[PDB]
């Protein structure tokens, strides 16, 4: 199924590690060392997108020196001491969410927990008032939505609805930013307005797209990370109990979950200058797809790479990327995923995988549905 691409990754890692897809004229790297270099060697592999212009005004499609300046300003709202300030608040949202599924022996992890949590957390951290939370969730859904099919009529119908959602969401953020200027709070928008690098501040044209990027890059990744982590835990007997009895292994397990079932399987780069990888030449301009999922299953990088080992420490996966584009939200994803698993391991003494349905999203590795038989404590 689409939830087991790993045999194919292993095949590619052994048969065509650096593969050229003649049809699309795009490269694909699967070896850990090759993927690591493609996503980190900024001098030879760029993030800028020449042609085919969902990421464009964000720092994801930027290179230095433009990227460096915005990255150093947005980093001030995600420091370790800021993460500790959010912890208690995220714990309350999590308990409220898990609490609603009390009184049932079967739950759907996605619809009842993993999908709504990240939206609820980012909404709360962005200072979205409770009266506008329902409308904010709709906008977010439209932002991370994909068309029914590749049929051009279906694609054009979707673009119109998604472009209006983006316009209304952007306008909503535009007004919130101005309102927060005269009444600053502890919300991320308030923090970004006050952030300054020698007097250099983000403008409204850079602030609004960054807010959209937080939803775009953190909603489904976190949702899938939680889903994939729970699936990996229940897949290996005794692990659920092991984590419940020794709760300080959870962060390590979260890192192993990112290595075992990375929610973002591949990252995209564009050749900046002529170079080579494992006897094969890549010409400047060609698109490269670095498969993080395959790199984290590489047998030459990890011992017993096909086994979920919650005791691996340090974990050198590159599931959050590597280099100047290292996921800005990793501290929040790590915090949010830990709390989610802590809540599950406290509210339930036993959980059993009933059925799963993979997320149909091509560029994503996660579950649409995760039916679980559960026993409350
Ligand atoms: C939940 C698990 C997540 C995973 C596995 C993940 C993965 C990644 C990866 C691999 C990149 C590198 C992109 C590149 O090199 O082109 C990235 C970038 C980024 N992520 Fe995440 N992400 C996650 C969650 C989040 C969250 C929760 C947020 C925000 C709250 C977030 C915000 C960002 C941003 C802003 C960037 C751009 C960094 C830059 O371009 O400098 N991500 N993410
Ligand atoms: C990794 C990522 C999800 C997948 C994105 C990636 C940007 C590049 C990209 C190009 C595509 O056209 C498909 C999605 C991908 C592969 C995103 C940047 C951060 C986000 O989490």
UniProtKB/TrEMBL annotation:
**Which is one Pfam family of this protein?**
p450
Q: Which residues bind Ca(2+) 2?
A: 196, 199-200
Spell out the Gene3D superfamilies in the cross-references. Answer: Cytochrome P450
- Single GO molecular-function term? heme binding
- The organism sits in which domain of life? Bacteria
Q: Which UniProt keywords apply?
A: Calcium, Heme, Iron, Metal-binding, Monooxygenase, Oxidoreductase
Q: Which SUPFAM superfamilies match?
A: Cytochrome P450 (SSF48264)
Record InterPro entries: Cyt_P450, Cyt_P450_B, Cyt_P450_CS, Cyt_P450_sf
Residues the entry annotates as binding heme b: 47, 67, 71, 269, 325, 327
Q: Which family does it belong to?
A: Belongs to the cytochrome P450 family.
Output the PANTHER family linked to this UniProt entry.
CYTOCHROME P450 YJIB-RELATED (PTHR46696:SF1), P450, PUTATIVE (EUROFUNG)-RELATED (PTHR46696)
Protein name, UniProt field: Cytochrome P450 monooxygenase YjiB
Q: Which organism is it from?
A: Bacillus sonorensis L12
């Amino acid at each position: 199924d689409p939830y087991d691409p790993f045999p194919w990754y292993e095949k590619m890692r052994k048969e065509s590690p650096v593969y050229y897809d003649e049809d699309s004229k795009v490269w694909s790297v699967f070896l850990y060392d090759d993927v690591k270099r493609v996503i980190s060697d900024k001098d030879f592999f760029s993030n800028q997108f020449p042609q085919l212009e969902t990421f464009a005004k964000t720092m994801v499609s930027m290179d230095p020196p433009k990227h460096t300046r915005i990255r150093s300003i947005v980093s001030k709202a995600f420091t370790p001491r800021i993460m500790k300030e959010w912890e208690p608040r995220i714990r309350v949202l999590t308990d409220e969410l898990l609490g609603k599924a009390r009184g049932r022996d079967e739950i759907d992890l996605v619809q009842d927990f993993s999908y709504p949590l990240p939206v609820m957390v980012i909404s709360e951290l962005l200072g979205v008032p409770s009266e506008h939370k329902e409308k904010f969730k709709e906008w977010s859904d439209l932002l991370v939505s994909l068309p029914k099919s590749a049929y051009e009529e279906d694609v054009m119908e979707w673009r119109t609805i998604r472009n209006k959602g983006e316009e209304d969401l952007s306008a909503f953020f535009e007004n919130v930013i101005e309102e927060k200027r005269r009444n600053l709070g502890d919300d991320i928008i308030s923090l970004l307005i006050q952030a300054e690098e020698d007097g250099d501040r983000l403008s409204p044209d850079e602030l609004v797209p960054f807010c959209n990027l937080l939803l775009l890059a953190g909603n489904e990744t976190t949702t899938n990370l939680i889903s994939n982590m729970v699936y990996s835990i229940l897949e290996k007997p005794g692990t659920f109990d092991e984590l419940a009895n020794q709760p300080d292994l959870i962060p390590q397990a979260v890192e192993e979950a990112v290595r075992f079932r990375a929610p973002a399987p591949m990252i995209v780069r564009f050749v900046q200058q002529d170079t080579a990888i494992r006897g094969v030449n890549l010409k400047k301009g060609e698109g490269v797809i670095a498969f993080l999922a395959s790199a984290n299953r590489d047998e030459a990088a990890f011992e017993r790479a096909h086994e979920f080992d919650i005791h691996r420490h340090p974990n050198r996966h590159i599931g959050f990327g590597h280099g100047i584009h290292f996921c800005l939200g990793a501290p929040l994803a790590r915090l949010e995923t830990k709390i989610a698993l802590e809540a599950l391991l406290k509210q339930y003494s036993a959980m059993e995988t009933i059925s799963t349905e993979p997320m149909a999203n091509s560029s994503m590795y996660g579950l649409k549905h995760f039916r679980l038989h559960v026993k409350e404590a």
